[model samples]
Target: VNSFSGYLKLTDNVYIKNADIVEEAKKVKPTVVVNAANVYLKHGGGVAGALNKATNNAMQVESDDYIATNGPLKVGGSCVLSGHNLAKHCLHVVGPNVNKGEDIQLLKSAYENFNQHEVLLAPLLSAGIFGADPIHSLRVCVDTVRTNVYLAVFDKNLYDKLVSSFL
Candidate 1:
């Protein structure tokens, strides 16, 4: 049976889920989906890559075109691009890289930059390749995210940690 085990209501309007972001976005149909993008806005790997593939590579083309015009998105900065298959738009943010000495402020900025949409689906930015600890990154997300947002957490262990945090 395809049980929905990971969905949890963190607040009246906020939620967290342990599922594929694309699948969740497809079902929930949020106004925007957040992408943990790199400075160059290349949708190459991780959440960015998955979103790019789900959008039939049009996202990559658009991202490339955006970079071509605007140069690179700085850490703590974001941009919106046309969403093809999932949400109406995709919000891309360049998160802080802890290994490069970036801090929580940048991560918070990334989350804060999510457009004021009715519904949003986002991943734990900076916790993967950027090397921020999952819980700490989640804290930043919890603190900064506004509006009706669903945190799409894919890692089972991390999801469990998130669930336990509120318990």
Candidate 2:
């Protein structure tokens, strides 16, 4: 995992990461992981799927309970808390399948709920198979939240661009 200071011109505590998330989890031991999930916690593909398997499917059970009690996790919708694997707490967010302008709006809103937490671990929301630029995702996440943000970059090419883009 890569750790650097003043990412996006921010002060210390903002981290730009590039590594296997599971390995990153073991290394950093983040206080909370802000997960991107679909309605059913399908955990079938993308980061959600990897996080699910890493946590022993704890997020699935949480998703089932949350949906049963609450309702469908719509785009820019509510967040769910999950088991202690990747972090002490997992903030499962229902990520949107949005286009360019729409993604930033939704991401900023999706993250505001967890902004109060001290340390947050997050993948580049909606930037993978969900189809948004990882650089944009990282920037918004850094701008919106007022705490330690670990933006995990699974793709090395994107990682290089994300760092070089701002450097």
Candidate 3:
């Protein structure tokens, strides 16, 4: 019975929604579910934590192994791993840390990495603990993401802002 409150079309196949990303990703089972990750690819708090917990920490184990094998991800870099219970694959992207004075281009690079997937379920990268402004982060997502995408927004106020600004 859960569904998006509203949606704004970004392209023929891309859309942005006011909804819980984890719920939608689990239901839709997109080609990839994007995880807003730290440089170490740790599935700590925020979106990463939710995805990790939902997968019964299987994602965390995968992430750890990925780091062990591939090394720490650079800002705006990404890697793929098992989605566990959420989707076909989990795309772990390290966005810019605004608090560290990283620029929006780094955030855009994170989103650009999503372009390869045929279908993606993603949230606003860096809009949470990474400290990127939600509105700006959403703009980057809208601008950079191609292919089929469902951009999920969890905060009602932020959702409202998106509705007003984009819709």
Candidate 4:
């Protein structure tokens, strides 16, 4: 997870180790640039998934921008959060299989560092690790994502942002 101070000047300015390299462009301050279409970064986390959700609410912080091409690997068994499903641009992808020990560190880091504004990449099969029908769990996610508060997942797919003024 990379959060730079400026905006998306070139390509994967933060998340990727070696971005495709887009034509560089000038940007102003306070601007954010996220590359979610293809999270070139390898690996992901699980318990961190829970932690990320918690801090997003507790800290009242969110990613300024978020986009994703794929993934949200699961930690184990299919579980669901009932009404709590889907996010504005919170691209929830199910991840591939992995041994418990392998993903621990990544999970720990993700839990501690999962920021709402950044693009989260992972596979889809693993969503069950978080407990639930991945798609079904995404229910309220999209509706609640907000703007201005930074507690948002500014989606590149949605049309009108869930500005507080709307709901």
Q: In terms of TM-score, which candidate is strongest?
A: 3
**Could you give candidate 2's per-residue lDDT for residues 1-167 as a string of tens digits?**
33432234334656765777766775656767777776565677788888888878877777778778887776665564754566777777765656433545687777665577777767777779777667777677767778777677789888888888853
The estimated TM-scores of all candidates read 0.88, 0.82, 0.90, 0.20
Q: Write the residue-wise lDDT of candidate 3 on 133-163 in tens digits.
A: 8888877777788667778887878878876
Query: What's the lDDT for residue 113 in model 4?
Result: 24
Q: Could you say which candidate leads in lDDT?
A: 3
Candidate 1 lDDT over 53-113, as tens digits, reads 9889999898889889989988998888887888888888888978788876778778778
Per-residue lDDT of 1-167 in model 4, one digit per residue for the tens? 22323222212211111111111101111122211111222212343234234334321122212213233224321111111122222332222223333342233222222234344322222233433333321222222222211222223222122232122
Count residue pairs with overlapping backbones in model 4: 29
Ranking by TM-score: 3, 1, 2, 4
Worst 10 residues of 2 by lDDT: 1-10
Model 2 bad stretches (over 4 Å): 1-10, 99-104
Candidate 2 lands at a TM-score of 0.82
Q: In what order do the candidates fall by lDDT, top score first? A: 3, 1, 2, 4
Q: Alpha-carbon error at 94 in model 4, in Å?
A: 1.2
How many residue pairs clash in each candidate at the backbone level? 0, 0, 0, 29
